Amino acid sequence: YPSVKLEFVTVKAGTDGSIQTLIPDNGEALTVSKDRTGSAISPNTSRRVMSNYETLSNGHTATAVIYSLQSLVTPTPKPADDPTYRDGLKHDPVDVVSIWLGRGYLNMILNLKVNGGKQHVFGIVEDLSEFETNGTVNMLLYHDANGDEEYYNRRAYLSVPLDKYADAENPGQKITIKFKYYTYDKDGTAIESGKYCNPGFEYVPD
Ligand SMILES: [Cl-]
Ligand SMILES: [Cl-]
Ligand SMILES: [Cl-]
Ligand SMILES: [Cl-]
Numbered sequence: 001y002p003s004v005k006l007e008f009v010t011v012k013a014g015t016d017g018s019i020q021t022l023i024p025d026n027g028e029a030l031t032v033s034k035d036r037t038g039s040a041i042s043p044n045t046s047r048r049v050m051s052n053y054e055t056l057s058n059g060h061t062a063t064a065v066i067y068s069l070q071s072l073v074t075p076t077p078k079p080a081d082d083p084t085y086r087d088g089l090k091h092d093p094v095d096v097v098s099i100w101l102g103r104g105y106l107n108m109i110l111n112l113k114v115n116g117g118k119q120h121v122f123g124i125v126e127d128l129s130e131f132e133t134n135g136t137v138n139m140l141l142y143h144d145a146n147g148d149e150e151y152y153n154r155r156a157y158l159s160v161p162l163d164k165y166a167d168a169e170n171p172g173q174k175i176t177i178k179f180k181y182y183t184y185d186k187d188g189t190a191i192e193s194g195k196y197c198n199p200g201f202e203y204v205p206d
Contacts (some may be wrong), residue, residue, distance in 0.1 A: 002155060004068055006036035006050040008107050011069070013041045021063040022053055025103045030055065048074055048105070048159050065150035072157035074105075077139060077164070090144035091182035093190050097155065099179065101120060101203050106139070106177055113150035120145055124160055131132035135174055136200070137165060140192075141181035166205035177201040 011032075012021035016038035023029045033056065039049050052068035078084055090113040097109040123142030130136035130168065139160070165175050183193045 001145055004052045006052055006070070006157075008072070008102070008159060009049060009053070010046055010103070010104075010159070011051070011066075012042070012046045013043060016045050016072045017041055017043050019066060019069070022051065022066065023105075027055075030062060030064040032066060035066045035070050037057070037066055039066075039069050048072060050157050054083045072159055074159050074161060075123045075142075076161060076197055077124040079126050079128075084123060085142070087124065088155045089140075090121070090142055091140075091190070092143045092145035093121075093182050093184050093194070094141065094143055094156070095183055096181065096193075098198070099196060100201070101162075101177075101201050104162055104205075106158075106162060106179065106201065108158045108160075110156040110158065112145075112154050113152065114145075114154045115149035118146040119154065120148065121155065122158055134176070135178045136150035136178055139177060139179045142178070143182070162203070162205060171202060171206060174202060176203055177203070 001049060008025050010023040011019045018041055019032050019035045019041070021029055022032050041122050049071050051066060052071045053066045055064055077168050095111040099106070113118065114121040121144040125140040125142050127138035127140070130138065131190045139189070154184040162177070167173055178197040180197060181193055182190050185191050
């Protein structure tokens, strides 16, 4: 478990790139009264990030004080035939710590065994073969450790966007996300886990 408690949030920058707004997943948008990180994103943009922050209230209105900010991976689900997967599908093992639907994303905290100097590349391999049949979206985690040794535990944060499944001309549509990922079994063998496929994550994009 990490030293600093981190939450999935959205941050917005104003004209100078400084963070002016923090939008918790659980609450309403808050004006950032103080950004102790001194972070700067692209002027007038929003980013889905990890943050340590606190809410301060005067009993009527509250503001956010940011203590830490870090990026998270926002992989767009893509079919196995997409050019990003040209060099083959990679499924280096991970553990799922926590996984849930929230604020238009499929959020997850992963546990990895890393070392250093190698970029861990994440993606979502999309299969829509059952989407017209029963609204099922099949997702397989892509993970390329790039030969990084499995020495130290490290968390990874993913927020899979689900906006592409919303149909404005088909409202009230119930979508079922069935997420698969490779992990180690009790004996240290890498296996494809269907743990989060039964019954899957049901949601109505509205
Ligand atoms: Cl982002
Ligand atoms: Cl106050
Ligand atoms: Cl769990
Ligand atoms: Cl990450």
